[PDB]
């Protein structure tokens, strides 16, 4: 996987710089809210070619650093259409000769070369960019405590309500990544506060409620906040 820069909320009209970090053709794809995957842009490994989709010409700029480790997507004049998860990925292309056009005289020496996209294989985890005039906020986290009202047979359920934050996304781990099975993190819903909220629940054996410690780890990059909450039985 390729490590990408952190999620951000951006003002309408401003610009975002998204990083992508392991030579390779580098493509920028995106997924807008309620939309299919969309091709934004690419930089050729040769460094000859930079290009974009039609709606992006004038707004986008692709760079990569001197030591060629990190690639860079600048996108300017942000609108609410530009609210998306932006993926960087590496690509394989064929650079083929389509035809040649020459004359005996030694004047005309055309030969057409074009690039043809074979594939995009290794993708970045993605960078969520939300366009909004609203200020960012870290989340309030509350225990969804295991009770008799959350047990089925010998299976108790517990978790963490993550609430009143902006913007997306938050990342919810459990016991610092140790506990990874049986976890449901629901897609957030925008509340009437214009802030997000979701629950992360875990199903576990009820005979662990005294024995095992359960702690939700909530990460919000745009607000520079991490919240650890321990969840105890009622």
């Amino acid at each position: 996987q390729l490590e990408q820069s952190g999620a951000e909320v951006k003002k309408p009209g401003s610009s975002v710089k998204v990083s992508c970090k392991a030579k390779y053709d580098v493509h920028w794809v995106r997924q807008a809210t309620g939309q299919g995957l969309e091709w934004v842009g690419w930089m050729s490994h040769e460094g000859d070619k930079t290009e974009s989709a039609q709606r992006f010409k004038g707004r986008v700029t692709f760079t990569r650093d001197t030591s060629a480790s990190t690639a860079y997507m600048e996108l300017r004049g942000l609108t609410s259409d530009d609210t998306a998860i932006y993926y960087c990925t590496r690509g394989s292309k064929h650079r083929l000769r389509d035809y040649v056009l020459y004359d005996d005289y030694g004047l005309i020496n055309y030969q057409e070369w074009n690039d043809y996209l074979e594939f995009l294989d290794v993708w970045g985890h993605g960078t969520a960019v939300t366009v909004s005039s609203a200020s960012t906020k870290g989340p309030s986290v509350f225990p969804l405590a295991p009770s008799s009202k959350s047990t089925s047979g010998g299976t108790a359920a517990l978790g963490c309500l993550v609430k009143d934050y902006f913007p997306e996304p938050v990342t919810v781990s459990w016991n610092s990544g140790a506990l990874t099975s049986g976890v449901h993190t629901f897609p957030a819903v925008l509340q009437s506060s214009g802030l997000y909220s979701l629950s992360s629940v875990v199903t576990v054996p009820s005979s662990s409620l005294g024995t095992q410690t359960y702690i939700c780890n909530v990460n919000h990059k745009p607000s520079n906040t991490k919240v650890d909450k321990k969840v105890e039985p009622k």
Binding site: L117, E118, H184, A188
Partner: protein, 217 residues
């Protein structure tokens, strides 16, 4: 140079036939014989991998159940024995004509056995209450199919439209669905009542199931 994709939804019984089609408008075959179309799968939380390249060639770590077919303008991704892991959104992508475009995707849903949900309920924390707010959470766990009714009752007095429902991606392993229904009130409004109840109607249950709790108790 749009590359329209059909169907828009595809239900499959695990162990049985999946097929989907990418259909371009201009041709995709270069003069070298190669068709520049790729197939990608995308599990909803996660980055897309590459399944098929050059129309027919499987990428690394792609099992032989995924087969690529087609030429020129017509293409077909075929899955011959569907595992629950194949629950994802599938995208075609043409690489011949500028600019390179994605299809709008095909969603694969797995039709499994009917599963009744586990119904749970969580009172608001005293900590959240101190902050002036009460969220009451109903949890629907591991059920099929996705269609379910959640109905809030307060002191057996029956609410409308103060609840927010959220539902998960279909499970990659169990092909089940899981749902949350959250009721959010001011602390005063929450304190004005005692009994909070989540009434759940699902197919797996002959009877609607109510999970209730008495505030302060």
């Amino acid at each position: 140079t749009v590359v329209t994709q059909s169907p828009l939804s595809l239900p499959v019984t695990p162990g049985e036939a999946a097929s989907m089609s990418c259909t371009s408008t201009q041709s995709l075959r270069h003069s070298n014989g190669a068709n520049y179309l790729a197939w990608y799968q995308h599990k909803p939380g996660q980055s897309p991998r590459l399944l098929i390249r050059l129309g027919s060639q499987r990428a690394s770590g792609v099992p032989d159940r995924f087969s690529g077919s087609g030429s020129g303008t017509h293409f077909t991704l075929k899955i011959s024995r569907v595992e629950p892991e194949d629950a994802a959104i599938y995208y075609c992508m043409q690489g011949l004509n500028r600019p390179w475009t994605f299809g709008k995707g095909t969603k694969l849903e797995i039709k499994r056995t009917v599963a009744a949900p586990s119904v749970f309920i969580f009172p608001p924390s005293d900590e959240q209450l101190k902050s002036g707010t009460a969220s009451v959470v109903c949890l629907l766990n591991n059920f099929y199919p996705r269609e379910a009714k959640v109905q809030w009752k307060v002191d057996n007095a029956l609410q409308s439209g103060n609840s927010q429902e959220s539902v998960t991606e279909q499970d990659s392993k169990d092909s089940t669905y899981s749902l949350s229904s959250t009721l959010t009130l001011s602390k005063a409004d929450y304190e004005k009542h005692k009994v909070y109840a989540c009434e759940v109607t699902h197919q797996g249950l002959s009877s609607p199931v109510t999970k209730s709790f008495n505030r302060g108790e």
